[PDB]
Structure 1
Amino acid sequence: TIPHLAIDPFSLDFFDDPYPDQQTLRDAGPVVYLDKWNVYGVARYAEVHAVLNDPTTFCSSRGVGLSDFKKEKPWRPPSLILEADPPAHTRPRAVLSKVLSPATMKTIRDGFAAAADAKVDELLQRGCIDAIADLAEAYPLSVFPDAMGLKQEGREHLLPYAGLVFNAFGPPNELRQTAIERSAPHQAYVNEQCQRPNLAPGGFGACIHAFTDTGEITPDEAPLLVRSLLSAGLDTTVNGIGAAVYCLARFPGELQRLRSDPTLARNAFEEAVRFESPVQTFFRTTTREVELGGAVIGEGEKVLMFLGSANRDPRRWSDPDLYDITRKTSGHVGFGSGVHMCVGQLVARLEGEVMLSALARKVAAIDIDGPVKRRFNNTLRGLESLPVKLTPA
């Protein structure tokens, strides 16, 4: 009843161009079995959304990578938020919600916007830049470590550690083995910065530790929640901003609409998150036998959710393969959905908005003008190098 496919969604050829295989995965049926890795897969919007919103059957506490924590040791101590189910999830989630709250965004908006404006003006003095190293990476590196309250020393471990985290959700392929092998120096840096004396007062890390007084988290939970922000909150925004710039470079008509109304910046970023889905995939593990798409999935089975595919499913989206900055984007699953829906989404959108606002006001054209190179990661989709010429407004 369930179709068996040989597609390896963690292969380099799949990462290089996933869209034909994602359609095969959708059109084969609402649920497929991937023989390469012995997992179920769901790639249509409706089933992806339903699984994300059914946490009592499709759980996260057995790992949201391929590895099942009931069968294997996690490569690092489990996350108290990503790799937890309610009720254990709830109070750590509330702490991160409060630390990254609407109210908190007021405290960082002026500096985040000023740094985006300054970066775009700086790049306009050069003309021809690499939108990854010089923009998608440079801008988050200039604001987010500081907003965390990190010291200066050791920051060169932040992107390597995040790449490791995201590669480690994948299957035990070469990308995962290479990431985990000799990763101890990256882990040691991050783990040390999670300790309270290393985090500047007022920054996100120190604010997490300040919640240990309230009873929401104990002091020994706070370093792992700082660890969550250092895992999830940098590389994602690099690939999100890079996706938006790549979208604007390829769709000049949409750059021109953005220039004409910079208040479209927030939805232009949201649409880039849908269109490229920088976080491509996550797993769940079934806690019980469960019918999904007419297939009976046993207990203890891994289920791979294709977020990027759900975000391009023609059953749900009109012209899914077009970048449309006035699209009604609500419902896309690029930040997830349900109890684990990205708790950093306001920070991600703040960064993306203010960068796209600066481009909208200051740039007239974005032209690719050198070799484009893709970056490969078991979970993240994005580019290694994106040479563009920026023309001033």
Structure 2
Amino acid sequence: TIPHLAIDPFSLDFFDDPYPDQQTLRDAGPVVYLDKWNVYGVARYAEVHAVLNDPTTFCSSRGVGLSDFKKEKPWRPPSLILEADPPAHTRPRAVLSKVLSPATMKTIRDGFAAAADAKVDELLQRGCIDAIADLAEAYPLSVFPDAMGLKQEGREHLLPYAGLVFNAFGPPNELRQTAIERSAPHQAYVNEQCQRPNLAPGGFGACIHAFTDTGEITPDEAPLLVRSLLSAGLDTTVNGIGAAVYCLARFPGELQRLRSDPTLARNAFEEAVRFESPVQTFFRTTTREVELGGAVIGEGEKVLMFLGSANRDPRRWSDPDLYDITRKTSGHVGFGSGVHMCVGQLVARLEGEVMLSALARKVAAIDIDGPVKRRFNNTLRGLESLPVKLTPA
């Protein structure tokens, strides 16, 4: 009854242009079977949202990559938050929610905004810049490692480590195997920085360790929760900000609306997160036989959720393929949904808001002016190089 498709959603041809195949995945039915990898797939908004909000049946403790932790060894010790279900998930989640809380955002906002303003002014002096290396990477690198409290030495391992993490959620294709092979130096750097003596007092890392006093996490849990922030907290924002700039470059009408009201910066970033969905996919594992979209899925089955597809499903979104900075974005799944919804979303939105605010106030036009190159990753969608000319306001 369930349709079987040969589409490989982790193929370079799919990454190069995923939208026709995402429509095929939605329109084949509410649930598909992907013969290439022997997993179920759900690509429509309703089912993706339902699965995310059904954690007792669609669990995370057997891994949110293709690999099932009940069957294979995890490539690194499992995340205490991402790869945990309630109740084990609950207190580690509360610790990160407090470390990255509304109140915490007050302590970093002025510096994060100042760094964005200065970066945009610097790029305007250069005029022709690469919006990936010179902006989407440079700006988060200038704020987030410091906000973590990381030392200077070794920071060149952060983005390679994150590329590995996100590649490793994928199937054992060439991207994943090349990522994991000889990755020990990246792992050793990150694991060392998670130990309490290496984290500057006052930064996110030290604050995680300070929560061991409360009973919410033990001392031996704190390094793995620092590791969570060093895994998810940088490369995501690189692709989120990159997506926003690419959107503004492609939709000059929307850049002009943002210039006219820079208070749209935060929703312009949220719409970029829906529109591009920098985190494209991840998995759940069934804990029991379950009916979904009229299909009966057995226990212990991997289910691939297409977040980017759900964020463009015309069943849910009007003009889903348009970038609209005044869209009512609430309900998009680019940050997830339910108990695992991105605990770093206020940090992500802060960075995106203040960069888009700096662009809105300082830049009059953004023109692609060189070869654009895509960056391939089993989980992340974004660009390797985005040459643009920035004209000052």
Query: Is the pair's TM-score, using the shorter chain for normalization, greater than 0.5?
Result: yes
- Shift of residue 292, structure 1, vs aligned partner: 0.2
- Shift of residue 173, structure 1, vs aligned partner: 0.2
SS of residue paired to 2:282: strand
Separation (CA, whole Å) in 2 of partners of 1:97 and 1:364 = 37
- Shift of residue 302, structure 1, vs aligned partner: 0.1
Q: Which digits, 9 at most, give the CA deviation of each residue in 1:19-59, with x for residues without a partner?
A: 00000000000000000000000000000000000000000
Q: Which digits, 9 at most, give the CA deviation of each residue in 1:166-214, with x for residues without a partner?
A: 0000000000000000000000000000000000000000000000000
Q: Which digits, 9 at most, give the CA deviation of each residue in 1:314-362, with x for residues without a partner?
A: 0000000000000000000000000000000000000000000000000
Q: Which digits, 9 at most, give the CA deviation of each residue in 1:192-241, with x for residues without a partner?
A: 00000000000000000000000000000000000000000000000000
- Shift of residue 145, structure 1, vs aligned partner: 0.0
SS of residue paired to 1:271: helix
Report 1:268-307 matches (<5 A).
268-307=268-307
Separation (CA, whole Å) in 2 of partners of 1:358 and 1:2 = 49
- Shift of residue 81, structure 1, vs aligned partner: 0.1
Separation (CA, whole Å) in 1 of partners of 2:14 and 2:390 = 31
Separation (CA, whole Å) in 2 of partners of 1:222 and 1:169 = 23
Separation (CA, whole Å) in 1 of partners of 2:94 and 2:70 = 26
Q: Which digits, 9 at most, give the CA deviation of each residue in 1:48-101, with x for residues without a partner?
A: 000000000000000000000000000000000000000000000000000000
Separation (CA, whole Å) in 1 of partners of 2:167 and 2:373 = 18
- Shift of residue 126, structure 1, vs aligned partner: 0.3
Q: Which digits, 9 at most, give the CA deviation of each residue in 1:113-133, with x for residues without a partner?
A: 000000000000000000000
SS of residue paired to 1:339: helix
SS of residue paired to 2:229: helix
Q: Which digits, 9 at most, give the CA deviation of each residue in 1:259-307, with x for residues without a partner?
A: 0000000000000000000000010000000000000000000000000
Size of the aligned set, in residue pairs, is 393
SS of residue paired to 1:160: helix
Separation (CA, whole Å) in 1 of partners of 2:147 and 2:264 = 26
Separation (CA, whole Å) in 1 of partners of 2:347 and 2:32 = 35
- Shift of residue 370, structure 1, vs aligned partner: 0.1
1:345 match = 345
SS of residue paired to 2:305: strand
RMSD value, Cα: 0.1
Q: Which digits, 9 at most, give the CA deviation of each residue in 1:123-164, with x for residues without a partner?
A: 000000000000000000000000000000000000000000
Separation (CA, whole Å) in 1 of partners of 2:38 and 2:368 = 40
Separation (CA, whole Å) in 2 of partners of 1:324 and 1:181 = 41
Unaligned runs of 5+ in 1: none
Separation (CA, whole Å) in 1 of partners of 2:331 and 2:372 = 31
Separation (CA, whole Å) in 1 of partners of 2:225 and 2:284 = 21
- Shift of residue 309, structure 1, vs aligned partner: 0.1
Separation (CA, whole Å) in 2 of partners of 1:301 and 1:171 = 15
Separation (CA, whole Å) in 2 of partners of 1:375 and 1:175 = 11
Separation (CA, whole Å) in 1 of partners of 2:138 and 2:254 = 24
Separation (CA, whole Å) in 2 of partners of 1:16 and 1:200 = 41
- Shift of residue 312, structure 1, vs aligned partner: 0.1
Separation (CA, whole Å) in 2 of partners of 1:116 and 1:258 = 16
Runs (4+) of structure 1 moved beyond 2 Å? none
SS of residue paired to 2:366: strand
Q: Structure 2 length as normaliser, TM-score?
A: 1.00
1:91 match = 91
SS of residue paired to 2:112: helix
1:389 match = 389
1:373 match = 373
Identity among equivalent positions (%) equals: 100
1:134 match = 134
Separation (CA, whole Å) in 2 of partners of 1:278 and 1:190 = 23
Separation (CA, whole Å) in 2 of partners of 1:172 and 1:122 = 41
Separation (CA, whole Å) in 2 of partners of 1:222 and 1:335 = 24
- Shift of residue 371, structure 1, vs aligned partner: 0.1
Separation (CA, whole Å) in 1 of partners of 2:371 and 2:176 = 27
- Shift of residue 310, structure 1, vs aligned partner: 0.1
Separation (CA, whole Å) in 2 of partners of 1:230 and 1:321 = 32
Separation (CA, whole Å) in 2 of partners of 1:211 and 1:77 = 21
Separation (CA, whole Å) in 1 of partners of 2:294 and 2:67 = 25
SS of residue paired to 2:164: helix
Separation (CA, whole Å) in 1 of partners of 2:234 and 2:279 = 12
Separation (CA, whole Å) in 1 of partners of 2:12 and 2:3 = 23
Separation (CA, whole Å) in 2 of partners of 1:116 and 1:149 = 19
